[PDB]
Amino acid sequence: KVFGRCELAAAMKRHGLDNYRGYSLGNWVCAAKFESNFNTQATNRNTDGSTDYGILQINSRWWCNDGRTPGSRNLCNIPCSALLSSDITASVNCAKKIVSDGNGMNAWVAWRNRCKGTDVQAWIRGCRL
Ligand SMILES: [Cl-]
Ligand SMILES: [Cl-]
Ligand SMILES: [Cl-]
Ligand code: NA
């Protein structure tokens, strides 16, 4: 599923991501824009053989099981395929664990490089929230 900008904001808000760990909703929408272009089915292979999955490009190295990342963990206790669903519940629940592990949203490289320090409220501007 390819979410619209305000559609995703509303879904993230309902699943309690708004101001989660102090990160406003615009931060989460901005991260998703540049991680996945709002596409729940996004996948990208990392150089170490792990894969990033879904709207927030969650890494099989640590967070989910895909059966093809030797030595990796599955800290969100989910199959990585669950992160590709049209329903973002699994991605949101796992992202809450990630952003709580000490490094905040710096866990998402695209967020650090393209959202951090910017006017992130622009990503939810005009949305009926
Ligand atoms: Cl594995
Ligand atoms: Cl959803
Ligand atoms: Cl933080
Ligand atoms: Na894994």
Curated annotation (Swiss-Prot):
SMART domains documented for this protein: LYZ1 (SM00263)
InterPro entries hit by this protein: Glyco_hydro_22 (IPR001916), Glyco_hydro_22_CS (IPR019799), Glyco_hydro_22_lys (IPR000974), Lysozyme-like_dom_sf (IPR023346)
Listed Pfam families: Lys
GO molecular function: beta-N-acetylglucosaminidase activity; identical protein binding; lysozyme activity
Residues the record lists as binding substrate: D101
Keyword Transcription appears in the UniProt entry: no
Keyword annotations of the record: Allergen, Antimicrobial, Bacteriolytic enzyme, Disulfide bond, Glycosidase, Hydrolase, Secreted, Signal
Localization: Secreted
Residue intervals of the C-type lysozyme domain: 1-129
Residues of the active site: E35, D52
Major localization listed first in the record, in broad terms: secreted
Entry's EC annotation: 3.2.1.17
Disulfide bonds: C6-C127, C30-C115, C64-C80, C76-C94
Note: Lysozyme C is capable of both hydrolysis and transglycosylation; it also shows a slight esterase activity. It acts rapidly on both peptide-substituted and unsubstituted peptidoglycan, and slowly on chitin oligosaccharides.
Subunit structure: Monomer.
Function field: Lysozymes have primarily a bacteriolytic function; those in tissues and body fluids are associated with the monocyte-macrophage system and enhance the activity of immunoagents. Has bacteriolytic activity against M.luteus.
Protein name, as recorded: Lysozyme C
Organism: Gallus gallus
Origin organism lineage: Eukaryota, Metazoa, Chordata, Craniata, Vertebrata
